Design a protein around this nucleic acid. Structure first.
Ligand SMILES: Nc1ncnc2c1ncn2[C@@H]1O[C@H](COP(=O)(O)OP(=O)(O)O)[C@@H](O)[C@H]1O
Ligand SMILES: Nc1ncnc2c1ncn2[C@@H]1O[C@H](COP(=O)(O)OP(=O)(O)O)[C@@H](O)[C@H]1O
Lengths: 397, 395
DNA sequence: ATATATATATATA
DNA sequence: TATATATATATAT
């Protein structure tokens, strides 16, 4: 485990303007919406790093569709790039309008990881994603999702988000706990992660090797289910508690079908399963559906990623089994419905601005993706290559 | 029989939402509906565990569709998360507005079994599903359904639902009048039930052995139909009345001494894996069961995770008219199982849509939570009473 | 000005 | 490929 200070340090923040500017922008929003058909007063002003949520209290009779279907013209008349209308704030009566600022400060990855949520976290595969709309950091947990879609068009930060997730893995767990599998169909982005002991294979490029890696993941899932069936334990955390107590009790356990040890948590990232499905066919779709159907209790987790938010790629079989979605900036409302079963993803800004959809029944929480760069990535990868030796399992292909 | 005191005790409920706190909400609802186009008057209030139905009488000359289009904004302006406008309360002249409570309240299973409906129930296979939208216990016999599909996404309260159904079997029925075939294609979930005398086998692992057990079940159904045709018997309950004509009333019979033919409830945890791995001959077996087996003595609790045409075709659709649907992720899946819409609107954690046989109208049922410790207690209470009476040649 | 009807657009059996 | 549903648009209110 390298220390957290090997990242780029925190710069000087400059936002959160004088309250006369916030009151002037509140009165400007009231005047512009009054010049349109609606009439609404600004309730409260919440500043933020990138955007500034204006909670406004709609008057009698005015609907929310009459606020959502003129956001284009409101963003034009407020001289900003694009505005976003929150249809529902949880537990209030108002309607959130989020306006970008003049200067747009980035999200610093050390400022994300310097949080007590990440620092005193319980699990072994956390995923620090970035701040909320006001600077409060979001740190999710991949063993609670248990799978993850990522989409959004180019120039929006998909590979930067995947690198933020993978450094969130690599700053906490040893290779005895979180052992990765990386399937990069290009040679472009995820090729930098070579050498670290957290891998199982060299970073898989060709699609026959991708299908072989998914079939080996199916085999690992089946042998872990058979082993936990023999030992009667429902989940992997209880299994590791059992085997740790058995090894510390002086009588370690045995082969159900030698000596067993603590199993790691396999995280299988995929960078473009659009192109993977394109080259191979429906067999990859059936394998991803099988893994997303069964592999929660066996520790196999997925980080999917795709450029195209279309029905050819994110099919219904993938949507029904993976309930946690990340939505970056997409092209239009049809792409937003394909990724989140609802609108609201097209109104973003890009360059690290996502809509985290939490697992289960939920409302999308706007998260700003942490900007992790090639300096930090290369430095932490060389740190792990100097702190450990590579270990590849040969028969995965 | 095991005692009902094995379950966890009914904790004194956090009966929140005082009558002034709901009277103020009703006055606020009629004011915030009068601010929009409609005019309304609140008729009565039914406070409940999870969702609270506000029965409202609309004004003269206003339509339900105005309330339906106005629904999301009404849910926005009342400081709640969602709403659902029931277009028709059966038998009344009102419109049901169901506002979900912000306190998702757990339903303990002893709070469902202790109803007088369940204790005075006579059939061998009751299913304690949970409470209704109003909070009253809903007990539904399995013998009148006659089969039951279960579908819903991962983390919706499905294994807890199958555990509640099987404990509803086990808290009333002896090993004489009920006997379970547990087809568990996942190796992980329902191995906890191993040891009870209510099994015909150790709990089945492989789809090959599961298909062998289903062939055995087809053959047992066929010999039961042939013996009922020999005895001139019009259903299973008529043959248990012939059992009452037998040594139950102290007059023995012959073997054309016929004992009880136990009602078989075949649970399948994931038949999606089976019907995608081994093919469609299993679907031929399931269709030949599900078309005929009501008057036979073999029933199926089918559970899955793919409400799709790849799993649930039209073959296993028209023959199972009683379906449990948990939280699915699309209206397309809702039309795939319930043949209507409204299944993705569920609030998760066992809150299902019991679709009764006959009337094709959904009946929403909150799922009863049963923990794994209560399961170990019931497994212990059955292992301390009876050795496993197997027909071991099923595999 | 705006709820309704309708022609067509995309997703699925 | 035929169709069920969904979305944008005259239209008359
Ligand atoms: N938090 C952020 N702040 C600023 N820029 C960001 C942030 N996150 C991502 N980016 C931008 O996203 C770009 C990477 O996009 P990428 O994921 O490679 O798109 P694709 O993989 O679809 O081609 C980088 O050039 C970077 O400038
Ligand atoms: N009646 C209930 N009340 C509250 N939570 C419930 C209830 N029934 C089930 N659950 C929740 O559902 C979870 C189990 O889901 P499960 O049936 O295992 O889904 P799956 O089988 O798809 O994994 C449990 O963690 C439990 O908390």
């Amino acid at each position: 485990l390298p220390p957290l200070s090997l990242l780029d340090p925190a710069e000087v923040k400059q936002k959160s303007y004088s309250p006369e500017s916030l009151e002037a922008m509140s009165r400007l929003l009231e005047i512009k919406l009054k010049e349109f058909g609606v009439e609404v007063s600004v309730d409260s002003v919440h500043p933020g790093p990138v955007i500034t949520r204006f909670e406004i209290q709609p008057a009698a009779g005015v609907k929310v569709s009459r606020i959502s279907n003129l956001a284009k013209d409101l963003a034009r008349s407020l001289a900003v790039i694009s505005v976003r209308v929150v249809e529902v704030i949880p537990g209030k009566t108002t309607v959130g309008i989020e306006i970008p600022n003049e200067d747009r400060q980035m999200v610093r990855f050390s400022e994300v990881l310097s949080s007590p949520e990440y620092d005193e976290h319980k699990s072994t595969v956390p995923l620090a994603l970035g701040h909320d709309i006001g600077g409060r950091p979001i740190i999710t947990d991949l063993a609670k999702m248990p799978h993850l879609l990522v989409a959004g068009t180019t120039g929006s930060g998909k590979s930067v988000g995947v690198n933020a997730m993978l450094l969130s893995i690599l700053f906490k767990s040893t290779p005895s706990e979180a052992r990765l599998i990386m399937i990069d169909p290009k040679m472009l982005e995820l090729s930098i992660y070579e050498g670290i002991p957290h891998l199982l294979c060299p970073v898989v490029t060709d699609m026959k090797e991708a299908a072989n890696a998914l079939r080996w993941s199916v085999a690992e899932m089946e042998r872990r289910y058979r082993l936990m069936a023999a030992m009667g334990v429902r989940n992997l955390a209880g299994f590791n508690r059992k085997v740790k107590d058995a090894e510390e009790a002086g009588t370690p356990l045995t082969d159900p079908l030698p000596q067993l040890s603590t199993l790691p948590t396999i995280v299988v990232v995929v960078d473009e399963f659009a192109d993977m499905m394109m080259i191979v066919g429906k067999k990859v779709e059936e394998l991803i559906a099988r893994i997303a159907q069964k592999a929660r209790a066996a520790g196999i987790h997925l980080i999917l990623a795709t450029q195209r938010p279309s029905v050819d790629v994110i099919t219904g079989l993938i949507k029904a089994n993976i309930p946690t979605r990340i939505a970056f900036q997409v092209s239009s409302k049809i792409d937003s419905r394909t990724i989140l079963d609802q609108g609201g993803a097209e109104q973003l800004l890009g360059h690290g601005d996502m809509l985290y959809l939490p697992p289960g029944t939920g409302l999308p929480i706007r998260v700003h993706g942490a900007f992790v760069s090639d300096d930090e990535v290369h430095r932490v990868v060389e740190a792990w290559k100097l702190r450990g030796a590579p270990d590849y399992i040969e028969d995965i292909l």
